[PDB]
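Quick one: sequence plus L0M SMILES, need structure tokens.
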Amino acid sequence: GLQGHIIENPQCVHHIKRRDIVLKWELGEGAFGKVFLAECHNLLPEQDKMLVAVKALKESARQDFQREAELLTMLQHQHIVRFFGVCTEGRPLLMVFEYMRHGDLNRFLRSHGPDAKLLAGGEDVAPGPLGLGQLLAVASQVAAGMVYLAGLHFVHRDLATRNCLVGQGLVVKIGDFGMSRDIYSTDYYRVGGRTMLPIRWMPPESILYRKFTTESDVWSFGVVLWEIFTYGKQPWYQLSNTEAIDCITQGRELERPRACPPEVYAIMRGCWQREPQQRHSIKDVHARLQALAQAPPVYLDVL
Ligand SMILES: Cc1nccn2c(NC(=O)CN3c4ccccc4Oc4ccccc43)c(-c3ccccc3)nc12
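Reply:
Sure thing.
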């Protein structure tokens, strides 16, 4: 079905009473519904009242909602956005997620870019552009989520920074509320009717043959690594959608970002081997990123 829609995977759901959810205000909006900030009571022992993100269904839908809830409940990992469960008592149908204070990683990258000064600094992040060690910590975390999805044989098909969230202490997790085509329409190619393909993130076998695997996700992860080291720039931004299809199917690679050490660009190139079976595993890409994120400053300073 839709690239990046969890029910594209063919592999218990917690219920929350409507009275325990108090909507505060809207956070975002798309064709399939809205996301609110809400207070959720009686959800976690430590917290009598905590903030959550609530996704309200705009309403087939109820059967898609049921299979989404099943698959979200099955995902339990430090770098997948936490799903608390559903409110099916009347309407609208609600899904309850942890609140990720910094929003999506593309927005977070662009607001800590090469132009950032003292004012960009805050609780969680230093002033000025994100440093090598912070960029590596972001990439490591997204890779760890992708290790977990690969271990469960899930394929994402729309992995991009816009589809990752950033929380307190710069925790980064894979997740979205199904509105990236509404909020970031320029990141998709419209192919008639309603279909919208994230071509700039897709390998040749996906664009040419419509094949999607663990190995096409690793390609997409390579593109995520490029977005991180460009502070959120669009891949192929100088190109039209058809120009980008021509570049990707002809074997052109994204150029080393200014902020990317050769060792890291080598990790991006391992994700971009033309032949899927020749790309490095997500386990290996994650081991190499984690090692660099955790490396002492004396080592990172000469990278
Ligand atoms: C309509 C639609 N079009 C595209 C993507 N859409 C999503 N997005 C995802 O399914 C992304 N997704 C995910 C996908 C694939 C593997 C693992 C995944 O882990 C997650 C973990 C937490 C949140 C989300 C995911 C939704 C949607 C539905 C209910 C709840 C939330 C989001 N609806 C859509």
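The chain has two domains: 1-99, 100-303. Residues 2, 4-6, 32, 55, 68, 72, 75, 80-81, 95, 149, 154, 156, 174-178 surround L0M (CB under 6 Å).
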